[PDB]
Amino acid sequence: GSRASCMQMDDVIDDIISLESSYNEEILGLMDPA
Amino acid sequence: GSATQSPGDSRRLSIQRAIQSLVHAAQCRNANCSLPSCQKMKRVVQHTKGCKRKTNGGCPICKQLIALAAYHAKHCQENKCPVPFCLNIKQK
Ligand SMILES: [Zn+2]
Ligand SMILES: [Zn+2]
Ligand SMILES: [Zn+2]
Could you write out the three-class secondary structure of A1-34?
CCHHHHHCCCHHHHHHHHHHHHCCHHHHCCCCCC
Number of structural domains in chain B: 1
Cα–Cα distance measured from residue A27 to residue B43, given in angstroms and rounded to the nearest whole number: 16
For B48-63, b/e burial (b = at least 16 CB within 10 A) is beeeeebeeeebebbb
Task: Compute how many other C-beta atoms are within 10 angstroms of the C-beta atom of residue B71.
Answer: 22
Length of chain B: 92
- Looking at beta carbons, which residues of chain B come within 8 Å of A19? 11, 67, 70-71
Structural element, H or E, at residue B6? none
The secondary structure of B33-55 as a DSSP string is ---SSHHHHHHHHHHHTT--SGG
Task: Compute how many other C-beta atoms are within 10 angstroms of the C-beta atom of residue B10.
Answer: 13
Residue B34 main-chain phi, psi, to 5 deg: -150, 50
- How far CA A7 is from CA of A2, A14, B43, in Å, comes to 10, 14, 42
Calculate how close chain B gets to A2, using CA atoms only, in Å. 21
Expressed in angstroms and rounded, the spacing between residue B74 Cα and the centre of ligand 1 is 24
Q: Are B19 and B71 in contact (CB under 8 A)?
A: yes
Q: Are B62 and B26 in contact (CB under 8 A)?
A: no
Type of residue at B64: Q
Q: Are B66 and B92 in contact (CB under 8 A)?
A: no
Q: Which domain holds residue B79?
A: 1-92
